[PDB]
Amino acid sequence: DSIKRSNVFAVDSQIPTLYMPQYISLSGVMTNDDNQAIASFEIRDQYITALNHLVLSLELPEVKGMGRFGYVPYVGYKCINHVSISSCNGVIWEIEGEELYNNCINNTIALKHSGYSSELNDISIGLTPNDTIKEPSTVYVYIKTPFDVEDTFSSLKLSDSKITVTVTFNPVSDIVIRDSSFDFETFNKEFVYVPELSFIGYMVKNVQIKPSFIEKPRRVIGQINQPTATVTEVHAATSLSVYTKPYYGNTDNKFISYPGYSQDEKDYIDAYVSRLLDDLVIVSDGPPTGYPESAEIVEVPEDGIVSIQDADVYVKIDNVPDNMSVYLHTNLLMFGTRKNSFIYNISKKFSAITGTYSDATKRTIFAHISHSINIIDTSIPVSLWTSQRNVYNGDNRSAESKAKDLFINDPFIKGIDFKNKTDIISRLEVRFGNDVLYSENGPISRIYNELLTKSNNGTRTLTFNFTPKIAFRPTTITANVSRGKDKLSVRVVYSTMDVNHPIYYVQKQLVVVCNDLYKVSYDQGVSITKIM
Amino acid sequence: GAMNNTIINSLIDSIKRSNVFAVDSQIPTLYMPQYISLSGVMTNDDNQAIASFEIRDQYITALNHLVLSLELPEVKGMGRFGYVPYVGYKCINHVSISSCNGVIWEIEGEELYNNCINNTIALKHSGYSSELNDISIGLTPNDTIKEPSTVYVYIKTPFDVEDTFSSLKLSDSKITVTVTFNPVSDIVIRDSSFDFETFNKEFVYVPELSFIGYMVKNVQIKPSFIEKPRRVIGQINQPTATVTEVHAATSLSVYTKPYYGNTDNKFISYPGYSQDEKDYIDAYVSRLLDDLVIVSDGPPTGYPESAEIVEVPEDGIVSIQDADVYVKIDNVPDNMSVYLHTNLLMFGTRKNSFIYNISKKFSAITGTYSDATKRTIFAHISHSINIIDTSIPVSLWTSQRNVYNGDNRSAESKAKDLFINDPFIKGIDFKNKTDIISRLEVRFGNDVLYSENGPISRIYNELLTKSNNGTRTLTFNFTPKIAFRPTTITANVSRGKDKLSVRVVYSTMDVNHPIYYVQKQLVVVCNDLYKVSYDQGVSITKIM
Amino acid sequence: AMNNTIINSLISIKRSNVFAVDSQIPTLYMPQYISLSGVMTNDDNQAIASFEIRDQYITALNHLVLSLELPEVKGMGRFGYVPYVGYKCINHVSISSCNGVIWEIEGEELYNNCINNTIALKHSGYSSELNDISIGLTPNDTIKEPSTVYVYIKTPFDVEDTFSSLKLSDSKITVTVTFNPVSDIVIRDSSFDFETFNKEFVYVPELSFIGYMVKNVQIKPSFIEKPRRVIGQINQPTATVTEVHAATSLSVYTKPYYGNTDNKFISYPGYSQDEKDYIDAYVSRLLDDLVIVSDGPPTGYPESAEIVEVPEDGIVSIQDADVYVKIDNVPDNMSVYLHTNLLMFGTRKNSFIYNISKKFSAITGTYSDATKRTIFAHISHSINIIDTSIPVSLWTSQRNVYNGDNRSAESKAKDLFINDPFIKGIDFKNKTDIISRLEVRFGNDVLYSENGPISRIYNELLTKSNNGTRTLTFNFTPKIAFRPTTITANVSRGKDKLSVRVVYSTMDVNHPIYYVQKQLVVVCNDLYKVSYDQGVSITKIM
């Protein structure tokens, strides 16, 4: 043929730079000077030319004693408060614990390694003061850095300089789900973080160092219930993410139910339904006892239907003794702002309850439950049911049920529900300087974020860099200081919720994440410079 | 130190080496992206919903990643209702992207779905939730069946393949995106009780097209190559289909589709959101069980004269011809007896020949009678029910070919039947499990291009595309996309090699089985190569 | 419309075009899926299939797929195929030419390379139809319907599609597939007639590949990675790979050896392959004999069995362990009984006992008068994956001072033979990590040493796998585009071998898992050069 063709059946195998990799594990220096746990790891070796893929391992201890206890899912990531990689010239790269987690949110393997098992995350119960609740375990946390992007090409080079990796830890309270029965006071005193930093080191023969570009995240958290947040000195940004976080400071961080390892939306709902059912349908000899005076427990008629206002509940239990009767708690949990206002009753959220009474165990075994319980219901702190805004008692459960409530202090919760299902941003407005950069009603920016990144856990994100990661200077939003366009102001309009619904009182915090472009220069030690 | 002594000595020069520890950061073309959302123009020209979106801006240099949002309304009233899974994709009948020079790219709704079938995120966004897909029941004429929702449909185009590089460029031209919608009947699963007549009248498609626009400073446009699908649907029950004017094809896909025109599109059961094979079967078993095993005081009533309900003997075994059914129910009242419907659903072509009985498909039924609810709670069911059984339209049980009554269920059960009009069903079953092609033959003109017995072309399709929902596909292009000109099957018009003729050999099915009467349609998809030239407006030319 | 802040932001330096690309005309070729029938040769009477590829138009090939026609299984008894049956069928694969072997792999190593390809594993046979244990009632009853399984033979010629393809310089390429005995791929009970099945069963293979007809092919030399395994002596914590000159990676894992047993196990979960599924299947199998509702003391159990009646209290005390048993709808003439020593193990007559009945804390259910059996509602136990992985032989071994298997004859008849060739660790799920320390020596000097499985963590991380091994990677350089980075050897210094030493964690001698034999497996990936000058040939880099 006359035409010149490109070879698609063969390739010239290039000889690469002569190097040798090695997995290096290092023990750190623990410091507790708010008495926050800080681990410092010093990397200095004449043969370690470059490094990447930082993995922090943590030896979790044996948990002995009484009460309910369980670690948060992906415990290893939740342990980290802040990570900082510095040199003699200063901080090269740094991240907030939540942002590291957010970057690793789609890496299923990294999340599994950090601690995601029935052994770690299911809520285990200790019976004797020497009973083992949790056996000792080791978790591996992948510290994803921009030095991993293109493996050897993106690796952090060491120009005979001392690289220091500083890991700040969140209090153990954050990574633990426990009940009142558990002796947390002793546990918090005795618990110590046992870390070990691992990395892939490279010994390079005649390394030809060239300058590079690195993306670094920056978050700004707005004031409690303020729908505005501003990121200053925005000169070269690659992306801008916007999300909400719930503030549970006004509460005691206690919740009725938790599903454990099983983390699906249905799992959260089923756990809640199970916890309520114990007090919702009662088989007792005469009127049930051990409930507040405020509680309205009605006997189920021969018809099987109990009418709570317009809501009808069908309750039918088999093998009930002749001396006993079937009862229904018509106001298990209720909320109202006024005496002549809408009432949010959890008992009204049930339509059908069927089961069989066990004479052997003296308890009701529920077969089928027809309800309208949602993720939000499972995400309401117990404090909000008994808040000052409520004209009613609120929590009409038994003392036995209330004692089973669990403290959840997970630092990385988003939205207003445990699954971040409910979208509470009705409108988004992003301003560069004073002019509107972007505005939306629907979460189309989140839809694109989820689509482009092939993620199911996305955020309302504005991407400015669609340029390949390999051999390219990232495309950034250019600033105009003279025109005043040197800042990014975000304003949201929260979705209007009913005042008589307890979720309305969940304090919100707007989080704005900005990824800034920096230049890496290895001339006279490792140093990073902000692009301006 | 930290590095091992064996490593240090191994390294610690003359040969030229490629730098693997650093890279030259190239300065890219100066551009700025922006997510742009546009409201369209609704047209009803029979009376097909057509949305037109006009894109014309001097600063929108290029665009890609088309996302069509749809506002689903609040569904109020009585009866059973639910949307089909991935409702957003099923909503689309045809998509066309055109310019002043004509159509640039166009796709059939099913082919867009087929291209997005492996994108789990895109399928979730289009409408895949218990809130949307489970069959909800309305009790009062003002009861809310379904709350309003917004779905997002990703219109995957060849302009997304290599992001900015593959993007559709606008040479100061008007780009028009035309979306033709399928009737709402297709995207809805409802019963007779539901007022569909009022719903069909009141329902309107509310769309909004979104895309990633790019403002490029001094754009250097170069010509490109685009692959465009083209389907041919063969005649009802015919095992042949031919694609004409095949000059430069990159691939050829072959699959089967059922035709339910001869039926009223009604089916006994539907699993809702839970879409697994077992879910479909369990739903069917659950729907049948209500009439299959009856606890009654004397012989059961409310069943046709044709029904043969036999009392279960002390041994527990009821013999329906060769088939033995073991039925044992606990807590049965002394005044009542356990009964078994021995011919719940039956089919036969001749007066005393072979019979396909659904009751014979059960071997063991165990449970406990509830005195409180006056109903039987089934514990364990041993059966041989398959996906095909759940995919048989009710019409075929009561067809003229059947010598028997067919549907011997209660009127209560029959009233619970659901209309399913999903436009993207493949094969002869709801899960496309049953492979009905015993042999495939592809002819380029008069000569055999490819032939197979097993679905090895589907195995390669699934393997190469990392898909679990593949088709018998012949790929001709194994060359990297965008970077090169795609490898195509070259035509020979003179010899008569300007057409692809597909011939299949369907599996031979039993005449006494209702699935035999399910009309089939062979679908052949051809991906043709086209050249994109941006000289004096955007234009595409077929490679010949 | 574009926003005013964007237009003003944009409206001399050399820029790379990111919005357009020059469409290169590729090498003129035509692909074709080619399927070939082989030559079956039984000459240990191992099934060997040979496929000869020689055609003037087949210039190059890649993506080898082995089809396998599984027959209809008729008769009586319990039968089921192993998960990913197609991969388990293969014992060895060899691709050779007139110059010799180009590339070869062990069946387990091919499986290990394809372990993360979900599609390839599904194609090989992963269904409820194939993997659940079906039961045949009549001698003419169909246990399993005939099926076709597709096995993807992943070769280094698939890495960069057309670029990495195996070129044929007018040479005869022979693909040789050695099969494992059908015993390995089958889970059956004693009731099943395996003797007749093993005689009648024949491997029906067909090799498929993507052939390419290239016009004026410009062949250039390439680099290939080839695996090599070394299996250590039974229970030996050391293994050595000789002639290591240019290795890209080194994997280390453990395998159980069930030669000292009859390969029979109490339970198997079928298609459902999760850890919980394995445990639940075991609990279900034990429960039949664990809690008995009988009129007077239960019968049909060995003299050695200690079946105690459950008191009004509901608690039965087996030494320190307390079992709460409460069953509803029990007839007045009948009583609730608990087998206090269903399975037990001890090395000394009056010492520590490992009792499976002690592993249960609560058992609740309801007696069915209609079916005359107990339907269990909730079971609170401490049963683990190891328990489900103990062969029945070890419960009744000579080491045991007790009888061991105190189950009913009915339960014992339900035991299944499992001969899966690709089991790792000491449990069916390879959950239990038994390596306490790993030591790798290149020559006589320590190359790498670790306590924790940080090499496995990196393996799982870098390869995006959930089924990883303690692996040492030496090549972090891009595949095909570059010559792979390898460990360089020094023959003169004796640095030409990789010696692996492990420290296994020791189990309790009174636990039946201690008597499960281990085997250390060391995999070495060596670099080879492919030269197509005067036929296809591979040369080891030294």
**Which of A412, A428, A447 lies at the terminal end of a domain, its last residue?**
A412
**Which of A412, A442, A474 lies at the terminal end of a domain, its last residue?**
A412
AA letter at A397: R
- Say if CB A82 and CB A97 are below 8 A apart: yes
The rounded distance, in Å, linking the Cα atoms of B397 and B388 is: 13
- DSSP letter at C26 equals B
The rounded distance, in Å, linking the Cα atoms of A40 and A86 is: 11
Within 8 A by CB and 6+ apart from B173, the residues are B56, B99, B100, B101, B537, B538
Note whether B18 contacts C482, CB cutoff 8 Å.
yes
- Say if CB C90 and CB C69 are below 8 A apart: no
DSSP string, C135-152: EE-STT-EEE--EEEEEE
Q: How far is CA C346 from CA C266, C305, C384, C386, C391, in A?
A: 19, 15, 19, 17, 16
Alpha-carbon Rg of chain A, whole angstroms? 28
Q: Is C533 helix (H, G, I), strand (E, B) or coil?
A: coil
The rounded distance, in Å, linking the Cα atoms of C517 and C234 is: 7
- Tokens standing for B471? 């088709």
- Say if CB B394 and CB B264 are below 8 A apart: yes
- Regarding whether A294 and A189 lie in a shared domain, the answer is no
The rounded distance, in Å, linking the Cα atoms of C13 and C30 is: 43
- Regarding whether C224 and C350 lie in a shared domain, the answer is no
Residue with tokens 């069953």: C327
The rounded distance, in Å, linking the Cα atoms of C235 and C435 is: 12
* Neighbour subunits, B (≥3 Cβ pairs < 8 A): A, C
- Tokens standing for B171? 């040479």
* Neighbour subunits, C (≥3 Cβ pairs < 8 A): A, B
Within 8 A by CB and 6+ apart from B509, the residues are B515, B516
User: Chain B residues with CB inside 8 Å of C10's CB?
Assistant: 30-32, 215, 217
- DSSP letter at C16 equals B
- Tokens standing for A111? 């999340």
Residue with tokens 């109202």: A336
- Regarding whether C352 and C221 lie in a shared domain, the answer is no
The rounded distance, in Å, linking the Cα atoms of B226 and B245 is: 17
- Tokens standing for C62? 């890649």
- Nearest one of A391, B224, B374, B82 to C17, comparing CA atoms: B224
Sign of the CA dihedral running B443, B446, B447, B452: positive
Note whether B224 contacts C23, CB cutoff 8 Å.
yes
- Say if CB B509 and CB B356 are below 8 A apart: no
AA letter at C331: P
The rounded distance, in Å, linking the Cα atoms of A326 and A304 is: 9
The rounded distance, in Å, linking the Cα atoms of A20 and A412 is: 38
Pairing of strands C246-257, C307-309: unpaired
Among A2, A8, A154, most C C-beta atoms within 10 A, so best to mutate, is A8
Resolution (A): 3.1
- Regarding whether C261 and C295 lie in a shared domain, the answer is yes
The CB density around residue B454, as the number of other CB atoms within 10 Å, is: 19
Of A22, A442, A454, the CB nearest to B7: A22
- Say if CB C319 and CB C358 are below 8 A apart: yes
Residue A472 Cα, gap to closest chain C Cα (Å): 9
B447: β partners:
B444
The rounded distance, in Å, linking the Cα atoms of A529 and A512 is: 22
Pairing of strands C360-368, C321-328: parallel
Taking CA B424 as the corner, what is the angle to CA B421 and CA B429, rounded to the nearest 5 degrees? 80
Distance, C-alpha B244 to centroid of its chain: 26
To the nearest 10°, report the CA torsion of C386, C388, C390, C396: 130
AA letter at C288: D
Method used to obtain the model? X-ray
- Contact of B4 with chain A, judged by CB distance below 8 Å, is answered with yes
- Say if CB C326 and CB A363 are below 8 A apart: no
- Contact of C445 with chain B, judged by CB distance below 8 Å, is answered with yes
The rounded distance, in Å, linking the Cα atoms of B54 and B37 is: 11
User: Chain C residues with CB inside 8 Å of A16's CB?
Assistant: 477, 482-483, 485
DSSP string, B148-184: -EEEEEEE--TTSTTTTTT-EE-SS--EEEEEEEPPT
The rounded distance, in Å, linking the Cα atoms of A258 and A33 is: 34
Domain count, chain C: 2
- DSSP letter at A362 equals T
The rounded distance, in Å, linking the Cα atoms of A206 and A435 is: 50
- Regarding whether A254 and A230 lie in a shared domain, the answer is no
- Contact of B9 with chain A, judged by CB distance below 8 Å, is answered with no
The rounded distance, in Å, linking the Cα atoms of A40 and B31 is: 42
- Regarding whether A117 and A49 lie in a shared domain, the answer is yes
The rounded distance, in Å, linking the Cα atoms of A52 and A40 is: 17
- Regarding whether B210 and B98 lie in a shared domain, the answer is yes
AA letter at B95: V
Among C215, C327, C476, most A C-beta atoms within 10 A, so best to mutate, is C476
Domain that holds residue A465: 1-245+413-532
The CB density around residue B451, as the number of other CB atoms within 10 Å, is: 12
To the nearest 10°, report the CA torsion of A205, A150, A113, B118: -150
Note whether A456 contacts B34, CB cutoff 8 Å.
no
Alpha-carbon Rg of chain B, whole angstroms? 29
- Regarding whether B134 and B245 lie in a shared domain, the answer is yes
Of B22, B33, B125, the CB nearest to A210: B22
Note whether C220 contacts A142, CB cutoff 8 Å.
no
Q: How far is CA B261 from CA A176, B395, B396, in A?
A: 60, 11, 12
**Which of C374, C389, C422 lies at the terminal end of a domain, its last residue?**
C422
The CB density around residue A452, as the number of other CB atoms within 10 Å, is: 17
- Nearest one of C186, C195, C371 to C268, comparing CA atoms: C186
User: Chain B residues with CB inside 8 Å of A17's CB?
Assistant: 17-21
- Regarding whether B506 and B408 lie in a shared domain, the answer is no
User: Chain A residues with CB inside 8 Å of C473's CB?
Assistant: 21
Q: How far is CA A167 from CA A57, A430, B213, in A?
A: 12, 33, 41
User: Chain C residues with CB inside 8 Å of A145's CB?
Assistant: none
- Regarding whether A274 and A238 lie in a shared domain, the answer is no
The rounded distance, in Å, linking the Cα atoms of A481 and A235 is: 9
The rounded distance, in Å, linking the Cα atoms of B168 and B152 is: 21
The CB density around residue B277, as the number of other CB atoms within 10 Å, is: 17
- Regarding whether A88 and A141 lie in a shared domain, the answer is yes
- In what order do the strands lie in the sheet containing B323-330? B317-320, B323-330, B362-370, B375-383
Residues in C 182-241 with any Cβ partner in A closer than 8 A: 212, 214-223
User: Chain A residues with CB inside 8 Å of C217's CB?
Assistant: 9
The rounded distance, in Å, linking the Cα atoms of B458 and B435 is: 11
What values do phi and psi take at C395, rounded to 5?
A: -70, -30
Q: Is C425 helix (H, G, I), strand (E, B) or coil?
A: coil
AA letter at B362: F
What values do phi and psi take at A306, rounded to 5?
A: -115, 120
- Regarding whether A391 and A462 lie in a shared domain, the answer is no
- Say if CB C497 and CB C242 are below 8 A apart: yes
- Say if CB B285 and CB B385 are below 8 A apart: yes
Residue with tokens 């990014």: A488
